[PDB]
Design a protein around this nucleic acid. Structure first.
Length: 548
RNA sequence: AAUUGAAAAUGCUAAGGAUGAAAGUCUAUGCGUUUCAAC
């Protein structure tokens, strides 16, 4: 019982033609867009009849995706129609399922357009035809390594959510209900009420909740079923409602809290289920062991984080009372968790702020150390991507450390001051390298908070940054730093004049760069050149605008 | 404006299927190796 996924092969002539056509289309060396459209139409004309062969070959599936993205709307409807009949088979194909994903996103966009203009309802009907094609295969798709992706995308589209957001006719809401009900029928044998559900079916569905392929689909369904099913049938198929613990449910919960797929399943459903059901799970199976779970950084930590992010204030504060003392340990092996804990503390009116500040100070910027620097204890700057000769991009550990340092800077002024001092202690060429970095740039950008930085630090920072005005403005990352400097130079009009003159000196290079044009706009240098006095008046207005 | 693949080359096998009176031959949708691609 396997659907047909082979539809013939192309001979070497066609393969060579389509390789050359993909190269030509990828270079995008066409002058007028009409030439590009005519070339796309030529590729489509040569691709007539061969659609099934093209989308099922690893050599030409990418070209088909490009063509689906670049063609017009009539050609899009043609390509959509040519797949008719074999949608399930294509969605079970390793390379064709991706083509189906591209096609379905573009076609959802087109259905949104035709819904908010002249109700053509042609694309809508093609979508309904493919959905009815797939409806007798939904349970199978849910467990398939490639078709489950297509099913998840279809559920996203139908429930109007962010695709990797478009409006949907009411037919799409009905089709969503159809898909969800069909799957529920397929997992409840023939039970006509929830009292008829057997314990064996519940056991097998929990098995699916832990399956690496089905679990994302179960999460999405649990999330979106509240749109039409007030009773949350799929939720009730996983967890109980009794006010007391259940041995089967307790073993299932203790398995979720120790398995990666299960922990992420629980993390995801926690944020999309009813608050009362989540509170029940917390009270029955988690309230007593919060610390032990919070230390499980690959499993239960995600659940504790979701609890901190989605519970009521009393329970959030109890969890913070449990967790904050362990923050120094947690940050050694799970910095995203610590950043979340600090963020939650801050959003809860700075709850337990003093203990957090003490732990962070003693761990990252102690007073007794001689050469204290928070860029070296947090970002590990000396052993980082910064200033390397080879073309290595910034890593993920650097990105999470930068997020953490920025969380500290937004948590208390002590960390903003510490970061500014640490920056001024580097050799200024290293700070300028930070300004040019992909991830560390944000860190620099984050200390440019005008009302929170005393005037002397602003003067030192501004003198360091002004010498590289033109080079920063024309840079992808430094241009945002210059934009922040526009406001950062408040009571320091002489640095405004210095940066303005510096940019005007190389006006030509500044305007040739795109970011240079953006900085030219944001600093309003046209008013500086044309009428200096209106520029000074704008500056004098901004001064008392920032400092009243 | 920040491990998998019906991919190539080259080999192994012939259950099923084709042919044959039989022997045999052909055929991979089963496989080895070296590349290629992707995540």
């Amino acid at each position: 019982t396997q659907p047909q996924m082979f539809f013939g092969v192309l001979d070497r002539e066609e393969l060579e033609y389509f390789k050359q056509a993909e190269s030509t289309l990828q270079l995008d060396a066409f002058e007028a867009p009409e030439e590009k459209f005519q070339f796309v139409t030529s590729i489509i004309e040569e691709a007539k009849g061969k659609e099934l062969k093209l989308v099922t070959s690893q050599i030409t599936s990418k070209l088909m995706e490009r063509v689906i993205l670049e063609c017009d709307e009539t050609q899009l409807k043609d390509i959509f129609q040519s797949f008719n009949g074999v949608f399930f088979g294509l969605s079970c194909h390793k390379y064709a399922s991706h083509v189906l994903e591209t096609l379905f996103v573009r076609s959802a966009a087109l259905v949104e357009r035709e819904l908010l203009t002249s109700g053509s309802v042609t694309m809508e009907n093609m979508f309904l035809f493919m959905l009815n094609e797939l409806k007798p295969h939904l349970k199978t798709m849910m467990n398939h390594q490639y078709a489950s992706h297509v099913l998840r995308l279809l559920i996203l589209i139908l429930s109007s959510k962010t695709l990797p957001v478009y409006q949907t006719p009411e037919s799409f809401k009905s089709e969503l209900r159809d898909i969800i009900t069909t799957l529920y029928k397929g997992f409840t044998n023939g039970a006509e009420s929830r009292s008829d559900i057997s314990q064996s079916t519940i056991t097998k569905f929990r098995e699916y909740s832990v399956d690496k392929v089905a679990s994302p689909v179960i999460q999405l369904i649990i999330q979106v079923e509240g749109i039409f099913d007030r009773d949350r049938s799929f939720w009730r198929l996983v967890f109980n409602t009794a006010d007391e613990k259940d041995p089967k449910e307790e073993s299932f919960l203790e398995y979720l809290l120790s398995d990666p797929v299960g922990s992420h399943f629980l993390e995801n459903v926690i944020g999309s289920a009813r608050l009362k059901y989540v509170e029940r799970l917390y009270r029955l199976y988690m309230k007593d062991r919060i610390v032990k779970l919070a230390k499980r950084d690959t499993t239960g930590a995600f659940v504790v984080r979701a609890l901190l992010e989605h519970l009521k204030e009393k329970d959030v504060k109890q969890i913070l009372d449990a967790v904050v003392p362990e923050l120094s340990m947690l940050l050694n092996s799970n910095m995203d968790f610590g950043t979340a804990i600090i963020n939650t503390s801050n959003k809860q009116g700075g709850y337990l702020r003093d203990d957090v500040i003490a732990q962070l100070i003693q761990k990252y910027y102690p007073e007794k150390s001689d050469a204290k620097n928070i860029l070296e204890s947090c970002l590990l700057l000396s052993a980082s991507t910064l200033g390397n000769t080879r073309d290595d991009w910034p890593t993920a550990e650097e990105r999470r450390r930068s997020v953490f340092l920025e969380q500290l800077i937004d948590y208390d002024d002590k960390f903003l001051n510490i970061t500014i001092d640490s920056m001024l202690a580097l050799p200024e060429e290293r700070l300028i390298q930070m300004c040019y970095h992909g991830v560390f740039s944000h860190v620099v950008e984050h200390v440019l908070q005008t009302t929170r930085v005393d005037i002397i630090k602003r003067k030192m920072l501004l003198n360091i940054l002004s010498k590289e005005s033109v080079n920063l403005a024309c840079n992808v990352y430094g241009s945002h730093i210059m934009d922040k400097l526009w406001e950062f130079t408040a009571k320091l009009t002489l640095y405004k004049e210095r940066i303005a003159r510096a940019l005007v000196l190389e006006t030509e290079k500044v305007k040739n760069s795109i970011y240079g044009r953006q900085v030219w706009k944001n600093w309003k240098l046209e008013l500086y050149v044309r009428k200096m006095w209106d520029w000074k008046k704008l500056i004098k207005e901004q001064e008392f605008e920032i400092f009243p």
